[PDB]
Amino acid sequence: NEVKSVQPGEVCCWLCIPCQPYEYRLDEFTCADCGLGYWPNASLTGCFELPQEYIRWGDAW
């Protein structure tokens, strides 16, 4: 759920920042994201589809 924020700097000592909660982790050094209407994988390993919502047959509405 977190990425190593970069600073080549003096030495290779990294910071850590959690990604945007909808942005997953395809690279250890940078988050990744996918289209709107979509979602991150639980381990943030790719794009995931939020389940479609509609007025259902039995709902209160």
Partner 1 sequence: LHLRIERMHWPGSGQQLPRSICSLPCQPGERKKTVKGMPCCWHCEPCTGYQY
Closest CA relative to residue 49, chosen from 61, 59, 57, 37:
37
- Residues in 4-33 that interact with partner 1 by CB under 8 A: 7, 9-10, 13
Smallest distance from partner 1 to CB 13, Å: 7
Q: How many residues bind partner 1 (CB under 8 A)?
A: 4
Q: Which is nearer to partner 1, 7 or 45 (CB)?
A: 7
Partnered with residue 2 across adjacent β-strands are 18
Q: Name every residue whose Cβ is closer than 8 Å to that of residue 22 and which is 6 or more positions away in sequence.
A: 33, 39, 40
Q: Which residues bind partner 1 (CB under 8 A)?
A: 7, 9-10, 13
